[PDB]
């Protein structure tokens, strides 16, 4: 039951300079680290974290390194600066996962009511969202096997807590607050149309590749169940929304009546004092 | 920068606004204001307020540090 | 043996730990140590501002924990980079961010060991975006009054550091103090991703969220009729016949453009049915 | 209504002062106790007796009163 | 420097910086406590001596 957290990009910038560590310490490609924070609510804030000296064998991928010199006494420092900012979880880069991740979660679930794994992004080019949470889940099956523990897609976000823009919005040095209706809407048009419908192309990768080579999660328990939600309105020729067209007279009713009367008021706005200050500036020049 | 000026006017305002009182006005947009701290000041006052609203020793809003009539 | 205009290539995380160190750093003033790299003579860089324990006793030279120094640098050794300290930070979040009377002692107490050890004064409680109160000072001394106190070698950096020169007791403290120049680093290795998470985050996230609409307009249309009668009192106020009026009291705007972009939003909002559906 | 030690910074109630001495009262307590035996009281010896039965014995023996079980004066 | 005229004093080093042309007392609160304008003589009627 986690919708969102508040993300301070401060220790994300510590993921940036530990991303500067891994480029110069050697073979370690992926930036893996441990996420500090405090559960207040379903909404949460992350104010600090720390990035672990970690190694991972490509053969038998479940080989973790979370040193307890690096854990315990640094938790004594991080406890010593603040009793509040303790652990909440951990992180690593890459989009999908790591054969070790689940075990790495269970090393610190002894420390936290819900150790969250938030898989992070060092090079953002994404079509969807930034870093996103994964809570402790036991969904198993309708089967009755031993308990599944792989941590499922529990929504998060990049929240912004407090002032902090004496630095940040001074470091903007480019951007403008658009009074929406000034192209920002078409930016959202490109990102939801394009970045939504290429995700639809990922969904034809799903519903074509799963038809092609997809095993058991081809139709596990959510495909037809959200083919219902797909069956909101997928219909054939033009989908025939006959209620929605005089319902649309009730819609465009409002917008054209407001634009008609109100933009005639805008005709007073522009036209009248445009003429007055116009011809004052014109013939009062002489 | 027009919007920066507009939003700039109220950054340092409205959260922790102290209350003093008007006393006198020497000139344009700079005047004398007594305070509920006990002392008197001669500070630069805004172009925001209508200039005829400062006849009495009215309850006025000031900054802690800057002490500006807003 | 020579004086040069310096420079501070700042790690953005430094100012991040200062805004956390003064934002959460409750305005009872505190103290820390600055961890950068003495790169050369004519510049210096900071790469780290670390955190201090709850020294809620007093800003002092004695507040430094050396086993936290050694174990801190040790934890930089078990992480990738064991860099070098370059000085010290402190926080003045309460008052007008000027050099306290411990700074006038602990500065030369620290730079006795160091080379420069530039002070760091901060107050995030000044503003939210408009005022960036970062502050830094190099303690000149009465030993170096033999030479004049003019490095000057590259100018207009301390000419534009000279451009404010307005802090009350610091203007006064022109004796014993000359500040250092602080630019912000070309941080596009992070300003890129702060940009991409900045606008990939702060406008409807996945952006299939807004694409509320019309009862806002209902309330907004009652706004946008309810101000219209007092907006149209101004042509009555333009009926001065010959001339009797100073500055027109122009209330022409603030109700043009609200209707403009608001009903751009209402008409593309009218599009979103035939945009979302097909 | 107490004198307490409070931090200048955290404003936490730190300690209780052992200096609540109360001006004039604690000076009103006669600590010298000058001597006067009952040889000085001449002529009011019945008033000495009803005085002691009224006052001195409630200090010593309320069991003299409350094995009988009424009240002290 | 006029005697007992008031000045604009900086808070910097208390540098005696500007001089303020002013009136001193509650002059505003009661100095101008008149009844401004009203009417004419026509509504008096009788106490003309
Ligand atoms: Zn400080």
From Swiss-Prot, chain A:
GO biological process assignments: proteasome-mediated ubiquitin-dependent protein catabolic process
Q: Acyltransferase: is it a keyword of this entry?
A: no
Q: Pfam families of this UniProt entry?
A: JAB (PF01398), MitMem_reg (PF13012)
Give the PROSITE patterns listed for this entry: MPN
Gene Ontology cellular-component terms listed: cytosol; extracellular exosome; extracellular region; ficolin-1-rich granule lumen; membrane; nucleoplasm; nucleus; proteasome complex
Q: Which UniProt keywords apply?
A: Acetylation, Isopeptide bond, Proteasome, Ubl conjugation
N6-acetyllysine: residues bearing it: 200, 210
* Stored SMART domains: JAB_MPN
Named from the GO MF annotations, one term is: protein homodimerization activity
The record, for Gene3D superfamilies, names: Cytidine Deaminase, domain 2 (3.40.140.10)
Q: List the disulfide bonds.
A: none
Which CDD domains does the annotation name?
A: MPN_RPN7_8
Looking at the record, the residues that make up the MPN domain are 5-140
Keyword Zinc-finger appears in the UniProt entry: no
Q: Where is this cross-link: Glycyl lysine isopeptide (Lys-Gly) (interchain with G-Cter in ubiquitin)?
A: 176
Q: Which family does it belong to?
A: Belongs to the peptidase M67A family.
* Further remarks about this protein from its record: Does not bind a metal ion.
The UniProt function text for this chain reads: Component of the 26S proteasome, a multiprotein complex involved in the ATP-dependent degradation of ubiquitinated proteins. This complex plays a key role in the maintenance of protein homeostasis by removing misfolded or damaged proteins, which could impair cellular functions, and by removing proteins whose functions are no longer required. Therefore, the proteasome participates in numerous cellular processes, including cell cycle progression, apoptosis, or DNA damage repair.
* Record protein name field: 26S proteasome non-ATPase regulatory subunit 7
From Swiss-Prot, chain B:
Q: Where would you find this protein in the cell?
A: Cytoplasm; Nucleus
The protein's superkingdom reads: Eukaryota
The record lists its disulfide bonds as none
Job description of the protein: Component of the 26S proteasome, a multiprotein complex involved in the ATP-dependent degradation of ubiquitinated proteins. This complex plays a key role in the maintenance of protein homeostasis by removing misfolded or damaged proteins, which could impair cellular functions, and by removing proteins whose functions are no longer required. Therefore, the proteasome participates in numerous cellular processes, including cell cycle progression, apoptosis, or DNA damage repair.
Query: How does this polypeptide assemble, per the annotation?
Result: Component of the 19S proteasome regulatory particle complex. The 26S proteasome consists of a 20S core particle (CP) and two 19S regulatory subunits (RP). The regulatory particle is made of a lid composed of 9 subunits, a base containing 6 ATPases including PSMC4 and few additional components. Interacts with NR1I3. Interacts with PAAF1. Interacts with TRIM5. Interacts with ZFAND1.
Which family does the entry's similarity section mention? Belongs to the AAA ATPase family.
Output this protein's name.
26S proteasome regulatory subunit 6B
Ranked from the top, the taxonomy reads: Eukaryota, Metazoa, Chordata, Craniata, Vertebrata
What fragment of the whole protein does this chain represent? 71 to 140 of 418
UniProtKB/Swiss-Prot annotation, chain C:
Protein name, as recorded = 26S proteasome non-ATPase regulatory subunit 14
- Which top-level enzyme class is recorded in the Swiss-Prot or TrEMBL entry? hydrolase
Q: Name one GO cellular component term.
A: extracellular region
> Which EC numbers characterise this protein's activity in its record?
3.4.19.-
The protein's matches in PANTHER family, at most eight in alphabetical order, are given as:
EUKARYOTIC TRANSLATION INITIATION FACTOR 3 -RELATED
* Organism field: Homo sapiens (Human)
**What SUPFAM superfamilies does this protein's entry cite?**
JAB1/MPN domain
Q: Which SMART domains match?
A: JAB_MPN (SM00232)
What is the reported tissue distribution? Widely expressed. Highest levels in heart and skeletal muscle.
| MPN domain boundaries | 8-143
Function field:
Component of the 26S proteasome, a multiprotein complex involved in the ATP-dependent degradation of ubiquitinated proteins. This complex plays a key role in the maintenance of protein homeostasis by removing misfolded or damaged proteins, which could impair cellular functions, and by removing proteins whose functions are no longer required. Therefore, the proteasome participates in numerous cellular processes, including cell cycle progression, apoptosis, or DNA damage repair.
Question: Which residues are recorded with the post-translational modification Phosphoserine?
Answer: 127, 201
Keyword set includes Protease: yes
Identify its protein family: Belongs to the peptidase M67A family. PSMD14 subfamily.
Segments spanning the bilayer are: none
Q: Which Pfam families match?
A: JAB, RPN11_C
UniProt keywords (A-Z) are: DNA damage, DNA repair, Hydrolase, Metal-binding, Metalloprotease, Phosphoprotein, Protease, Proteasome, Ubl conjugation pathway, Zinc
One Gene Ontology MF term: K63-linked deubiquitinase activity
Residue positions annotated to bind Zn(2+) are: 90, 92, 103
CDD domains noted in UniProt: MPN_RPN11_CSN5 (cd08069)
Offer one example of a GO biological process linked to this entry.
Answer: protein deubiquitination
From Swiss-Prot, chain D:
User: What does the record say about PTM?
Assistant: Sumoylated by UBE2I in response to MEKK1-mediated stimuli.
Q: Look up the domain of life of the source.
A: Eukaryota
Q: Where in the cell is it found?
A: Cytoplasm; Nucleus
Assembly behavior: Component of the 19S proteasome regulatory particle complex. The 26S proteasome consists of a 20S core particle (CP) and two 19S regulatory subunits (RP). The regulatory particle is made of a lid composed of 9 subunits, a base containing 6 ATPases including PSMC3 and few additional components. Interacts with PAAF1. (Microbial infection) Interacts with HIV-1 Tat.
The task this protein performs is described as:
Component of the 26S proteasome, a multiprotein complex involved in the ATP-dependent degradation of ubiquitinated proteins. This complex plays a key role in the maintenance of protein homeostasis by removing misfolded or damaged proteins, which could impair cellular functions, and by removing proteins whose functions are no longer required. Therefore, the proteasome participates in numerous cellular processes, including cell cycle progression, apoptosis, or DNA damage repair.
As for family, the record states: Belongs to the AAA ATPase family.
Q: What is this protein called?
A: 26S proteasome regulatory subunit 6A
- The organism is Homo sapiens
